[PDB]
């Protein structure tokens with residue numbers, strides 16, 4: 350079977366075409382934000398403009414027509430209202446025109462679910478991006494969020510720090526490079542708050558220390574990563590300990606980070622459990638993960654009525670019953 354998926358919760362418009370076993374197409378266009386920040390209205394304009402060209406490119410690279418597609422899937426939420434609405438409108442339009450069933454997909458769930466195409470069965474997921482940071486795992490028939498950010502996503506925290514230092518968007522790779530050159534740990538506030546993550550205190554302290562001129566920038570970048578990532582690993586490990594699951598996945602745009610990967614490898618190896626990171630075009634915001642999750646939902650008998658396709662800006666991860674597992 351084939352599914353077409355449209356992702357557009359934030360600045361990236363992604364269209365994917367997948368089967369149960371493989372990705373046939375995975376195409377991208379991201380709104381250029383040279384000075385970072387969140388731009389919901391510009392993202393919406395971008396998605397609407399790029400919808401037709403990207404759909405054409407996805408169909409060409411997959412080598413199929415829209416008549417070959419079994420189900421249309423879209424990122425229903427959570428995310429930016431104007432951007433979500435463009436995506437949902439486009440998906441509904443395709444569904445009506447080609448008389449296809451439609452499914453709304455939770456963006457956070459999709460990030461974890463895509464790993465199951467690669468043989469992952471039942472993982473603790475660490476989902477880390479610009480605006481999102483969640484540790485999630487299947488419990489009681491739903492994805493339970495064990496810990497999440499109370500303020501800003503780790504990606505955004507790094508992006509703000511980068512901007513302060515004169516490193517333009519995206520900040521992540523640039524801060525990662527600086528961190529590799531660090532040779533001294535500088536004490537910074539720990540980012541675990543109860544079960545959850547909190548990065549605002551860490552970020553503001555790092556900026557204050559930067560403005561003091563007392564430290565090497567590379568040492569601050571190194572310390573920022575060591576502190577923030579150690580927190581991520583702790584929350585992930587706690588979830589593993591409780592759930593007794595034997596695999597961890599790292600997903601989201603921040604999954605590109607080699608240091609974070611290394612820290613998770615160490616933790617999983619010490620526990621004697623598996624660790625997996627999908628190819629990066631399936632880690633960052635993409636349409637293929639939407640297509641795959643949507644297909645699994647459809648095969649489980651899920652098919653949305655029109656009023657069920659209304660966007661959910663604050664879509665909670667635990668709302669969806671995972672009946673396809």
Ligand SMILES: Nc1ncnc2c1ncn2[C@@H]1O[C@H](COP(=O)(O)OP(=O)(O)NP(=O)(O)O)[C@@H](O)[C@H]1O
Pocket residue numbers: 358359360361478479480481502503504505507508519520521522525601602603604605606607632633634
């Ligand atoms: N090597 C890296 N280390 C740390 N952060 C990174 C790295 N590469 C990318 N990032 C961050 O990942 C984020 C981009 O992720 P991407 O999924 O492309 O968009 P997004 O809007 O953050 N996704 P979402 O929040 O899930 O809608 C940015 O904050 C980047 O700085």
Ligand SMILES: [Mg+2]
Pocket residue numbers: 477478479600601602603632633634
């Ligand atoms: Mg992402």
